[PDB]
Design a protein around this ligand. Structure first.
Ligand SMILES: Nc1nc2c(ncn2[C@@H]2O[C@H](COP(=O)(O)OP(=O)(O)OP(=O)(O)O)[C@@H](O)[C@H]2O)c(=O)[nH]1
Ligand SMILES: Nc1nc2c(ncn2[C@@H]2O[C@H](COP(=O)(O)OP(=O)(O)O)[C@@H](O)[C@H]2O)c(=O)[nH]1
Ligand SMILES: [Mg+2]
Lengths: 65, 436, 426, 63
């Protein structure tokens, strides 16, 4: 009887571990999604940053004359 | 905004006896049926009008019928401390018991007193003008709860139709159970609860015993201790219809908000803080802690570990001084936790209602007065464990056709025995199919 | 001349409008008793826009209060500044909606819209010349969303050339009060993008952030969120109620802020927002008001502009100040955030100045903004709607009440094309 | 004997699950660190946007 009790406890514990595992896996999918989205936003920002340098260079070229 | 109660069977009547005490105390009604004169608590000129009438000359009467076949419990109530509270005709008592026989309670004896019970329901509901719905209390471990209860649900759904039916049904505990032939009655009552109740809040006994021995610290509890906290849960659920609050939640969106499918309606109930009169003042009880204590696995009124499946829809009722900000923060933390995973198709899972009435207290109870309380009703997918567990030990009996003669001697058939068996099979299959 | 009529329903609508009526009554100087006690005649010269005097100096607001449940209307009558609403404005609901767009727009509407529309017609024709309708409601609720959009459509059918100003609270993922939020919001947007004239989309998480940071209120609550939101509704008609060097009515604001008819979802801001622990340690004039009003975190929407661009913006100043400094501040901030203003629409910012600052203050600045970053809120609503509709969850409550899935697809594709056009303007 | 064997199998299984959980949570911490760093980089880039825009306008105003 005691051995069956501890067996049931072990089953509950391992199912808790499994549910934590797949919850973490779904959280991983989520965080990877935000990682892609945020790199995209930062790439747009740095593209705008690089665009300004060319415009200011052109302004300097036109102001030299 | 009026709701009526019907109590069927020993468990139903006893829970109602331990609940109407709380109701009258909460609204300040004296046990003899009239409010006092000089003492004045709260403003409730229509806050009493939900569960109680008012017979003109200051004598409130509850909107409830108790009904039994074994007249012992009913006349115990009739001679108890609430002789005057009840109407002398809402307490219906037949002659002979059903004796753990769904067939005897639903076919032979049941069909001779439901005609009076539902007539009383008719000429009780004619007295209201804002009726919301019914709520039933029954144990499916016996005859009166299963048989007469299923018959009354059938003949009330066919009569009043659209109105909601909040069931508060006591399933047997997995291994602890007084009755022995009770799995048969459990499946027979399931095959009527599935298609005739909009929301069926489950209640168990080992779970409540575990609660009242771990948190409440009462190592020798009893039914007078179980029914008190069951009544606490009922009152926390139905407080909004009686008390105004920051965010009132009424009976329609418990269905339009917690029942994503026409058949997947099975509630796990929880209540925090289940606390004693010694730990109470030594613990700082705020929204975050009470919510975490509500959501811990070993705080559910039904013994099933809600880690196997996923949560489909949670509803949290708060009583007492709680602000929207900290409850929003608490549910945010609950979502952030790593132990519970919500179902995928339901991103927003919680609905929080709030009320300004602090939890009541019964002199002579174990739950000390507290500033606030939370009651959760959660539609989950971890009830397939319960249903399959009962199914296996039904099959064990049914293989040998044991006890079946007691049923066929009153009108059952192996046809509907197998029908209820495959009905449970279909229900658990539906849970498996919806979980994915 | 110009007359505004107020329409208010749902818990959000009723509570927010109660705080609104409190604020405006206190500003015009009338007590909750219903009589005038002010001194300056500027508080009397324009009472007609919001009030209709009945007899002997007893003023009654021009509002309509609608609900399917007495639980909120009893509370609003219990609350202060609630003894002024005419009882005829209480179209009295008995049953309730229970978080159901179908119930609010197809079942309860059948027997409540007739009464509410007759009352609103009485109110509108009771004046000399309509300026327009000011409606407040939700999108995720039961009565404010469904019945609100029903009444909005009916009024747009009846009065086709009067302006419609909606103040609609939009659900946010952080604060999830219910679960039918995606369906309700989608089905309300379906009506709003076609019938409503212009809509102030608002939320609750932004208001809570404001109370945390810019107000430092330790324990914010709805009783203060409603005040904060009511401030801008009281301030948006400062021109209509008061003189000024450069007036601008609702028609002026709309013709300045709506380049194309399908762009009427604006964000709101209010300045100055400061705690009582810092009201004594700050300076109040046009530069700091401009900074606080162009601050990205001062928005009352779950849509920061820094991921999008401004099609247009408008400022409503109240208090004596130099239009020279106002104009130079606007030009300076335009140059500062050139990347956040669409280039091919020069002078993206419009300004207006009035005479009387709000009571208890010497200066104020309300802000309205049409920016193509508002599509983020609709994106994170549509994601929830998709994740729900793919499983057809919670769907029987609607589909067993006269609906089907074709209009679900209609609303979904509506938001898809709307965010698409916002992007292609970006 | 059978029940004890089942116990041992269960404990081995749950140990494997625990090890996988630990590696997953460590990788989660790494992801969150990358989150914070990249958001900081975005703030710096936005400040650069504003400064360069102002320089552009000031230079152009001469022409
Ligand atoms: N939790 C709880 N359970 C109760 C209480 N009273 C009775 N029960 C349950 O009721 C079951 C007894 O079967 P019932 O369905 O009540 O049968 P009955 O109501 O006496 O009617 P008959 O079956 O005809 O005798 C027991 O297994 C208990 O679990 C109670 O006060 N609290
Ligand atoms: N700002 C604010 N929002 C509220 C308040 N009460 C409820 N809400 C929001 O309103 C929504 C519910 O709308 P509801 O009142 O049910 O709509 P109705 O049923 O048609 O009247 C919820 O999502 C809440 O977040 C309040 O007092 N203040
Ligand atoms: Mg019995």
């Amino acid at each position: 009887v005691g051995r069956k009790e501890e067996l049931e406890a072990e089953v509950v514990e391992t199912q808790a571990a499994q549910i934590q595992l797949d919850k973490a896996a779904e959280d991983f999918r989520k965080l990877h999604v935000e990682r892609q989205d945020l790199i995209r936003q930062w790439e747009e920002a740095v593209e705008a940053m690089r665009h300004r340098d060319a415009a200011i260079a052109a302004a300097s070229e036109q102001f030299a004359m | 905004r009026e709701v009526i109660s019907i109590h069927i069977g020993q468990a139903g009547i006893q829970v109602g006896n331990a609940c109407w005490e709380l109701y009258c105390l909460e609204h300040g009604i004296q046990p003899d049926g009239q409010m006092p004169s000089d003492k004045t608590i709260g403003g409730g000129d229509d806050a009493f009008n939900t569960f109680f009438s008012e017979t003109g000359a200051g004598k409130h009467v509850p909107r409830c019928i108790f009904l039994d076949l074994e007249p012992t419990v009913v006349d115990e109530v009739r001679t108890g401390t609430y002789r005057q509270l009840f109407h002398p005709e809402q307490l219906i008592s037949g002659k002979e018991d059903a004796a753990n026989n769904f067939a005897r309670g639903h076919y032979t004896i049941g069909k001779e007193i439901v005609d009076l019970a539902l007539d009383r329901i008719r000429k009780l509901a004619d007295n209201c003008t804002g009726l919301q719905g019914f709520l039933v209390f029954n144990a499916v471990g016996g005859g009166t709860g299963s048989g007469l209860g299923s018959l009354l649900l059938e003949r009330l759904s066919v009569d009043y139709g659209k109105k909601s039916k909040l069931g508060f049904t006591v399933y047997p505990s997995p291994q602890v159970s007084t009755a022995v032939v009770e799995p048969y009655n459990s499946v027979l009552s399931t095959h009527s609860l599935l298609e005739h109740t909009d929301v069926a809040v489950m209640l168990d006994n080992e779970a409540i015993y575990d609660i009242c021995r771990r948190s409440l610290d009462i190592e020798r509890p009893t039914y007078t201790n179980l029914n008190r906290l069951i009544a606490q849960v009922i009152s926390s659920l139905t407080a909004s219809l009686r008390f105004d609050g920051a965010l009132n939640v009424d009976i329609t969106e418990f269905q339009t908000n917690l029942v994503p499918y026409p058949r997947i309606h099975f509630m796990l109930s929880s209540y925090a803080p289940i606390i004693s009169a010694e730990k109470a003042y030594h613990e700082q009880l705020s929204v975050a802690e009470i919510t975490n204590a509500a959501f811990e696995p070993a705080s559910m009124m039904v013994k099933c570990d809600p880690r196997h499946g996923k949560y489909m829809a949670c509803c949290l009722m708060y009583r007492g001084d709680v602000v929207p900000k900290d409850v929003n923060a608490s549910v945010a933390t609950i979502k952030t936790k790593r132990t519970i995973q919500f179902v995928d198709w339901c991103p927003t899972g919680f609905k929080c209602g709030i009320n300004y009435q602090p939890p009541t207290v019964v002199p002579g109870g174990d739950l000390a007065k507290v500033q606030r309380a939370v009651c959760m009703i959660s539609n989950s997918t971890a009830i397939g464990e319960i249903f399959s567990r009962l199914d296996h030990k039904f099959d064990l009996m049914y293989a040998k056709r044991a006890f079946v003669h007691w049923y066929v001697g009153e009108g059952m058939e192996e046809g509907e025995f197998s029908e209820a068996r495959e009905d449970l099979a279909a229900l658990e299959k539906d849970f498996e199919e919806v979980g994915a | 001349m110009r007359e505004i009529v107020h329409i208010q329903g749902g818990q959000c609508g009723n509570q927010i409008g109660a705080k609104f009526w409190e604020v405006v009554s206190d500003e015009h100087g009338i007590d909750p008793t219903g009589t005038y006690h002010g001194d300056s005649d500027l508080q009397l010269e324009r009472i007609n826009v919001y009030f209709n005097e009945a007899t002997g100096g007893r003023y009654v607001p021009r509002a309509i209060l609608m609900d399917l449940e007495p639980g909120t209307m009893d509370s609003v009558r219990s609350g202060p500044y609630g003894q002024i609403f005419r009882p005829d404005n209480f179209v009295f609901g008995q049953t309730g909606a229970g978080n159901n767009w179908a119930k609010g727009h197809y079942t309860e509407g059948a027997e409540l819209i007739d009464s509410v529309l007759d009352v609103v017609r009485k109110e509108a024709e009771s004046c000399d010349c309509l300026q327009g309708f000011q409606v407040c409601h939700s999108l995720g609720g039961g009565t404010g969303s469904g019945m609100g959009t029903l009444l909005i459509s009916k009024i747009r059918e009846e009065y086709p050339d009067r302006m419609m100003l909606t103040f609609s609270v939009v659900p946010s993922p952080k604060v999830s009060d219910t679960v039918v939020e995606p369906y309700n919001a989608t089905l309300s947007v379906h009506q709003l993008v076609e019938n409503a004239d212009e809509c102030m989309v608002l939320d609750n998480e932004a208001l809570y952030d404001i109370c945390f940071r810019t107000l430092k209120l330790t324990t914010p609550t709805f009783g203060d969120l409603n005040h904060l939101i009511s401030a801008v509704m009281s301030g948006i008609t400062c021109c209509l109620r008061f003189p000024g060097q450069l007036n601008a009515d609702l028609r002026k604001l709309a013709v300045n802020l709506i380049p194309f008819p399908r762009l009427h979802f604006f964000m709101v801001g209010f300045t100055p927002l400061t705690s009582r622990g810092s009201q004594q340690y700050r300076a109040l004039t046009v530069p700091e008001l401009t900074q606080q009003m162009w601050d990205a975190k001062n928005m009352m929407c779950a849509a920061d502009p820094r991921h999008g661009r401004y099609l247009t913006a408008s400022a409503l100043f109240r208090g004596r100040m130099s239009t020279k400094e106002v104009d130079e501040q606007m030009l300076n901030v335009q140059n500062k955030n050139s990347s956040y203003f669409v280039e091919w629409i020069p002078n993206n910012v419009k300004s207006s100045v009035c005479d009387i600052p709000p009571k208890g203050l010497k200066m104020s600045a309300t802000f309205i903004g049409n920016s193509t970053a508002i599509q983020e809120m609709f994106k994170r609503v549509s994601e929830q709607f998709t994740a729900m509709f793919r499983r057809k969850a919670f769907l029987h409550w609607y589909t067993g009440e006269g609906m089907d899935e074709m209009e679900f697809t209609e609303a979904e594709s509506n938001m898809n094309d709307l965010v698409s056009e916002y992007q292609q303007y970006q | 004997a059978l029940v004890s064997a089942q116990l041992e199998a269960q404990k081995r299984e749950t140990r494997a699950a625990l090890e996988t959980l630990a590696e997953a949570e460590a990788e989660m911490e790494n992801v969150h660190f990358e989150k914070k760093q990249l958001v900081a980089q975005w703030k710096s880039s936005l400040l650069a946007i504003q400064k360069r825009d102002e320089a552009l306008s000031a230079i152009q105003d001469g022409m």
